[PDB]
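does this look right to u?? 2-acetamido-2-deoxy-beta-D-glucopyranose version
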Amino acid sequence: PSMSITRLFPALLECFGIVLCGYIAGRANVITSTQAKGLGNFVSRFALPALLFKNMVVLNFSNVDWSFLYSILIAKASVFFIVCVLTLLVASPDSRFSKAGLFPIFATQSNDFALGYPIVEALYQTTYPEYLQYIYLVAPISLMMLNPIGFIFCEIQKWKDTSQNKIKIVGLGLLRVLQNPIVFMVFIGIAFNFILDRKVPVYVENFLDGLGNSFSGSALFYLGLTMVGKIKRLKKSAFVVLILLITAKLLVLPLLCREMVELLDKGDSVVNHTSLSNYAFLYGVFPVAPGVAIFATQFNMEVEIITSGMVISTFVSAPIMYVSAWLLTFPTMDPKPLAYAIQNVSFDISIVSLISLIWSLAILLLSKKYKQLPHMLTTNLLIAQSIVCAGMMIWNFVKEKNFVGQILVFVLLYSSLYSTYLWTGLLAISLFLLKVQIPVGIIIISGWGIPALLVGVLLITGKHNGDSIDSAFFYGKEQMITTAVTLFCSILIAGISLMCMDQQLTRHVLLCLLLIIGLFANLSSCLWWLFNRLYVELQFFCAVFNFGQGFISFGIFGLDKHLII
Amino acid sequence: PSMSITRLFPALLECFGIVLCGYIAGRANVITSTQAKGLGNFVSRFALPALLFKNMVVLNFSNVDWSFLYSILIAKASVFFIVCVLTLLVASPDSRFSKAGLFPIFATQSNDFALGYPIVEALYQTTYPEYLQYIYLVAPISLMMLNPIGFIFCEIQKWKDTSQNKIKIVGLGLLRVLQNPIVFMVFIGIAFNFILDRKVPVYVENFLDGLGNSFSGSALFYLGLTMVGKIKRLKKSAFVVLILLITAKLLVLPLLCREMVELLDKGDSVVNHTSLSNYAFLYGVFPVAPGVAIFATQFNMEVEIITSGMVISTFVSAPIMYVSAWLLTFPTMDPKPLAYAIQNVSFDISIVSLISLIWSLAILLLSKKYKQLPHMLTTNLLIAQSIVCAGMMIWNFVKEKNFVGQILVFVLLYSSLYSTYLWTGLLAISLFLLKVQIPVGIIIISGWGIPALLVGVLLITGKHNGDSIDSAFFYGKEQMITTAVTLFCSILIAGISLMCMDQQLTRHVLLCLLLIIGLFANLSSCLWWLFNRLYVELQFFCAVFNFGQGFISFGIFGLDKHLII
Ligand SMILES: *[C@@H]1O[C@H](CO)[C@@H](O)[C@H](O)[C@H]1NC(C)=O
Ligand SMILES: *[C@@H]1O[C@H](CO)[C@@H](O)[C@H](O)[C@H]1NC(C)=O
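got this back:
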């Protein structure tokens, strides 16, 4: 296979684990915001310039697929042009030059070095070691091309706030690009590539190793530290804009990077073209660089949107990277190894979800929020999600073991999974009712007795498919019916409730909206399989939601500020 | 060879280059002392515990030479006991428990992880990869053994400043050891070694890699940052004590570590015993850990001595590591590859010295100190030292080229080298005269015409030995006579002047004292070779001084605070 896709989850755990470390450290005041600057200045002024310089010196320019680069740079210029033009059309005249400066940079500047590189190394170091080169090519050339334009727009905003001297405006944009270590150490590294015939001098090599190898962990930790307190409650428009920009960064850009490789890489080998198109997609899924938030702070422009969006982009990239890489690998796999891949995916996701759930439960418990409404109902949801994650980790082994194990593990897994769907409905209707002593005892048995009864209907009616690798087909058609019926109910309850619409109702709405979308995908898998490789893709998205929805619960209620005892 | 000794200078440039980066960054206020804490807390609470945990899990305890460990730990316990007892005998009663707490820790706690490990990796990774294990063994066990004793003495000092509750005093010592990440992540890592059958779980492995690999550069940079402003002018007694403690750390300890391996490693293989004895020596040359300065700050005891001493130990370790490793390699080398080794050494030292000289010159020039006395005479010294370093880098190639090159390069090299000796004398006598318009024009031609005349006496009288790899024998006996005569003069002038004893006279005295010792070694090489492998060792120490004395000039006047234009 072109991607060593099994190596990705370890690498994402490196990436987002060290981010989580930096985040916890900042949230705990292990490292204060002023202390974080020493890590940041180490990272940006020493560890990164050394990493760039070494990799630029080593780089074999006569063995670079320039068409891949052109493809990514054209995709970024396309996304930049779109977001810029739409901002100039859509935004208010008082701020459209700051927005059309920074929003296009947000949509195109990737976290290439801290997050992209360890992931690309994990995926490709053993199969396409040349793919690692293009991170050190794309990211700087991307800045050199696109950031002076965005900085010109911010300088126009600065002039408008004070466009008379055009060449001063252009020069201040270009100068702010030249003053970026990413740009000047790439110029210097290219020079020394040609001065040294690509050989790092042996005396300097280990110094550059020590600094460069300290970049990754140090930058990921600093990223975590700079994520602390940055999500601030945005107006509806600022939130819609942020969703659109993260979509530009994490959906529009990877789709164009893929398409541009397919237009402009005229190379012969289908496997190399495939893997390169896949790599282009993955390159697009990298989050927004923290540098963009730095530019926003330096210009004092769009700061909340850019900082929030960078943080959220980072969080959201983790599942999208994982999901995309597997989805891109699936058409190469044979049908059975694809089932095994989906159970692997499910196990991996079960672990992050389980841990994020155990944390979120501990917060809801120790904060005593679990006694308040709708937080009690939210706790029931997360218990169900936790049981789903444990049940999936158990199924990963019990899929080889006897029926007496499988039936129990399935009953666990699908009672609790159906419960997660039902609780999405029950939560949403409670938000309507709170927006009236809601009938908590009835709502609780509705979220727990009813799914146990529905699984009972499977033990009563269903055909036991113990040969199946995927528990989603363990009771066959009857399971798909039972699952669909559960989802049909919970989506109608949830949607009609949101239509009918501290207590945190807006965050519970956000939780329900995202969980609804996961229910809706699952409904689609059930109804698509009932009525009829796009199905197996959708089945994987269902697995991803089913075992990873605890991570959504964590992303909204795990990261709450309340603490106790 | 047992040490890949050619890899050491690259590794020392990694080590002390990243320290120099951290130092420059702090001195420039790129990173303020409060900002440095974020790097320090990353290093101590995340990067180091990950490094320790991974290496502890991986460690094959059934393949550890426990006798090596015992040897190092017995050497450290010996040095600890000596320094402790001598402090309890020699020190004043009001502070002897703080001194007998921290001085023995200073003499025994090595910078094992930030400096020792990359150096041991460089020397041994390809020949004795098992030698890397013992850093993760010795350093924690050393803390566990020895630091609670020193902390007990500091707690006795704390009680005396306020020994009634003995077990509280013992417990506070042990608790401060347990609260060290080095100790608890070693306990945890050993546990998980035995839980996981030495296999890091694959999901966790890359996370531990990212953090652990960020330790080295990050810790070396933080070390540099914490060296800023820490050398504060000590009383004569505090200075003598500091010299004695750095000698305990960097001479007494490596000699005992060597001897203890030779007493307690009863292993059969002479090459393995040799390399292990050499490794034990090198392990002893690691500087004082910054942790010791942290304990001093936490106890508020002996802070200046411990911090200054840790900084100076770090600086002084660099040459001692280099010099020792080569000296320990020399008895394995054949006589000719030993000559080539000495020219390699000379080249390496010429580079660090040359750069440190170019810096120190630029400071003395731009500060305009070069117009003041004795700083003018100090500038003449450093010009001569710079020419020596360039001349040696040229000789490294011209030793293969024709006599017309060699004679010119030698004339350069030995006029300027003799000038460095003469300038040591001329500087010292000027310190006496300043402690009287000193006859600067005469002193200048004395430092420059006289050595050119003496080299002329070589071009007049000497036999040209163009086959010689070492320029110290290029004009044979006549050169050794000329060199000796130069040294005999300059040592008598210098010594009689110091006996007869901003303007910085105390620092110029320190410069003269150290340069005198280098002259004295060189005199010994000349007179020993004139009158008669200990000679080749001494000849190497002469090369080391001759090409590295610029680094002494830098260590005293390069790191001055004055700046301009
Ligand atoms: C894909 O590219 C690699 C690297 O140049 C090359 O070795 C390989 O043969 C290519 N594959 C095919 C089938 O052309
Ligand atoms: C030295 O130790 C290594 C590691 O156990 C071993 O392989 C080697 O044979 C030893 N050398 C001799 C000569 O015993």
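The pocket of 2-acetamido-2-deoxy-beta-D-glucopyranose (ligand 2) is lined by residues B 269, 271-272 (CB under 6 Å). idk if thats expected tbh
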